[PDB]
């Protein structure tokens, strides 16, 4: 299933890949999960999240 994500909450690196702790638009805010940038089709949310950290 390809589900709509609202925004990113957090980021880490597992096994060399980069996973973002999301917040889904389709699901509840606590039902959020870690999805890697390779599976993320959201460049907007990734950029905005990095802009938030800086």
């Amino acid at each position: 299933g390809e589900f709509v994500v609202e925004k990113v909450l957090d980021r880490r690196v597992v096994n060399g890949k980069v996973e973002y702790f999301l917040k889904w638009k389709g699901f509840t805010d606590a039902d959020n999960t870690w999805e890697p940038e390779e599976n993320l089709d959201c460049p907007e949310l990734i950029e905005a999240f990095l802009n938030s950290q800086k």
């Binding site: 994500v5 890697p36 599976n39 993320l40 089709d41 959201c42 907007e44």
Partner: peptide
């Protein structure tokens, strides 16, 4: 006006 972004759930991990 509706900012929807798509993401696919990583069911497993191709190592």
């Amino acid at each position: 006006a509706r900012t929807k972004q798509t993401a696919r759930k990583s069911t497993g991990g191709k190592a």
